[PDB]
Design a protein around this ligand. Structure first.
Ligand SMILES: Cc1cc2nc3c(=O)[nH]c(=O)nc-3n(C[C@H](O)[C@H](O)[C@H](O)COP(=O)(O)O)c2cc1C
Ligand SMILES: O=Cc1ccc(O)cc1
Ligand code: NA
Length: 396
């Protein structure tokens, strides 16, 4: 059914429907599908779904010139721990990714692989099954006492990364980035947000290290910036974006309650702009908004009111993607896209609206999303959300 209380506004007349160059790609409009974990990949081997994923992505690529960022994709076994999320380290994984990318390119849209590493958000017992470590910035902090218990129950306690461990993650990012590009992706997005491994190094709650990877703003930023630099130099800066969530509390991050958190992110962005000034500008920065501090909460819940991402615009001068409860607030988008380098990521309503871009252009009602099929091994709730016309052919 359609979202009941929703009054659509047509955005055809705004910068949301003006083209923009992002890296090597040429977008027709600035409505971006952000990374969305859907757990349709098959076990063993974290293989993308061969029946439905190319259909799902192709449906949502239908408007030519759409930028699509894939679900989080593991760079290596050690970086994972979720059996039904995809990887891109292996030949069999890349075999299906080529077909997904072909489905998006057949629609004249673009595909960016979000490269993922889980750190303390992983499952210690699944990792142990596979002979893998339970990795974190500092083993003196756990997400919660439950994951602490399961960690001890699996005899796989948190492992503070060594310097050699970090170097191996950097190699795995390079490997996964190279596989992404050889498979046909137009670029990659380094996931450094939402409390996963790289965010765990940025945040002073998770990162209590005393080597060169913690203890200061500069040290906490080092792992993320080394991944950035490694990929700049192997696939080029125009094929690399970075995702950050300054105000997020998901996965036990500090958010705005830490008064030092804007300095931490301001340092990362300043370092990105320095690289751009020396001729190596990343394709984009992708920010999660304080509008959504936790994506497991319904729209309007978990909204942080005492901070904004405006600081980013004074530091980073390249494209910025913003994401968080924009689908139901066209009045906010209308304002924010007056800035000529701003794109809007639409998460949960891209799940439910394959023709979301058309609906935003024409101001049409939106399909409700069904939270119970966000993560089921099913085409139901994946590829069977109707387009607007189909929805009217159904009574909605
Ligand atoms: C089911 C679901 C899966 C998501 N998966 C990812 C992911 O793999 N990587 C990521 O960076 N963000 C992920 N997110 C966060 C979204 O990209 C987005 O930032 C957030 O949902 C807020 O945007 P929205 O209100 O438009 O949905 C996910 C969110 C949801 C709801
Ligand atoms: O499954 C939800 C999810 C949220 C944020 C992410 O970064 C990844 C997955
Ligand atoms: Na390879």
């Amino acid at each position: 059914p359609f979202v009941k209380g929703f009054e659509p506004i047509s955005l055809r007349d705004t910068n949301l429907f003006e083209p923009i160059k992002i890296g090597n790609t040429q977008l027709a409009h600035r409505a971006v599908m952000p990374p969305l974990t859907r757990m349709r990949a098959t076990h063993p081997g974290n293989i993308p779904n061969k029946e439905w994923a190319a259909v799902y992505y192709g449906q949502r690529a239908q408007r030519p010139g759409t930028m699509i960022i894939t679900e989080g994709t593991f760079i290596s076994p050690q970086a994972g721990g979720y059996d039904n999320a995809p990887g891109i380290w292996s030949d069999e994984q890349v075999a299906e990714w080529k077909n997904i990318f072909l489905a998006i390119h057949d629609c004249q849209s673009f595909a960016w692989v979000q490269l993922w590493s889980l750190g303390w958000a992983s499952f210690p017992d699944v990792l142990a099954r596979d002979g893998l470590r339970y990795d974190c910035a500092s083993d003196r902090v756990y997400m919660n006492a439950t994951l602490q218990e399961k960690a001890k129950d699996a005899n796989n306690l948190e492992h503070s990364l060594t310097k050699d461990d970090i170097k191996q993650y950097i190699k795995d990012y390079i490997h996964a980035a190279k596989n992404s590009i050889a498979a046909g992706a137009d670029g990659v997005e380094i996931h450094s947000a939402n409390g996963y491994l790289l965010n765990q190094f940025l945040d002073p709650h998770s990162n209590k290290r005393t080597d060169e990877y913690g203890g200061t703003i500069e040290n906490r930023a080092r792992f993320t910036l080394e991944v950035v630099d490694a990929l700049i130099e192997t696939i080029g800066p125009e094929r690399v974006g970075l995702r950050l969530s300054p105000y997020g509390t998901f996965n036990s991050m500090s958010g705005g309650a830490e008064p030092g958190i804007i300095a931490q992110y301001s340092y990362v962005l300043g370092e990105l702009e320095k690289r751009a000034k020396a001729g190596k500008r990343l394709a984009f920065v992708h920010l999660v908004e304080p509008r959504v501090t936790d994506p497991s909460l319904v729209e309007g819940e978990g909204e942080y009111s005492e901070g904004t991402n405006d600081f980013a615009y004074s530091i980073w001068k390249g494209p910025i993607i913003r994401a968080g409860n924009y689908a139901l607030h066209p009045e906010v988008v209308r304002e924010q896209v007056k800035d000529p380098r701003t794109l809007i990521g639409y998460g949960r309503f891209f799940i439910s609206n394959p023709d979301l871009v058309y609906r935003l252009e024409e101001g049409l009602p939106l399909n409700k999303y069904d939270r119970s099929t966000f993560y089921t091994m099913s085409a139901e709730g994946y590829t069977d959300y109707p387009t607007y016309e189909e929805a009217v052919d159904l009574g909605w």
